[PDB]
Design a protein around this ligand. Structure first.
Ligand code: HEC
Length: 112
């Protein structure tokens, strides 16, 4: 694509002022949130708790696995990551994800 997962994570770490922490990324992705849309309390509502399996939209359509081990071009287009993170953080959390959250989330997801 136009980027690598490491290049994306390093740009988020620079904006955040801190290195990514995949354990925090895992905890945020599995969390149940209350500030966003009622029908999407968690990242897992659509992607599932195991991101090597397929997920499902709110209507039951299949979502390719988020893990790069299952779907190889994941996180290789910088615009695409920002587009989905913008929409999906707002639906789940109710706000944009910060650059520190984005680094943590992608550091966890990039290793799956
Ligand atoms: C359903 C309403 C979703 C919820 C809740 C979350 N995501 Fe998701 N995400 C969804 C779709 C339909 C898609 C696009 C289809 C595809 O196969 O890519 C995505 C995509 C992403 C991406 C982009 C991956 C890439 O190819 O670079 C990321 C980084 C992502 N989703 C992460 C993510 C997080 C962190 C979420 C909780 C805040 C989350 N998603 C929720 C559908 C839905």
């Amino acid at each position: 694509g136009d980027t690598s997962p490491a290049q994306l994570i390093a740009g988020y770490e620079a904006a955040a002022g801190a290195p990514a922490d995949a354990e925090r990324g895992r905890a945020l992705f599995l969390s149940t949130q209350t500030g966003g849309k009622p029908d999407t309390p968690s990242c897992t509502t659509c992607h599932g708790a195991d991101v090597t399996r397929a997920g499902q939209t709110r209507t039951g359509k299949e979502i390719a696995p988020l893990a790069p081990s299952a779907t190889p071009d994941r996180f290789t287009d910088s615009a695409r990551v920002e587009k989905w993170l913008g929409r999906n953080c707002n639906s789940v959390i109710g706000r944009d994800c910060t650059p520190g959250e984005k680094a943590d989330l992608l550091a966890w997801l990039a290793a799956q």
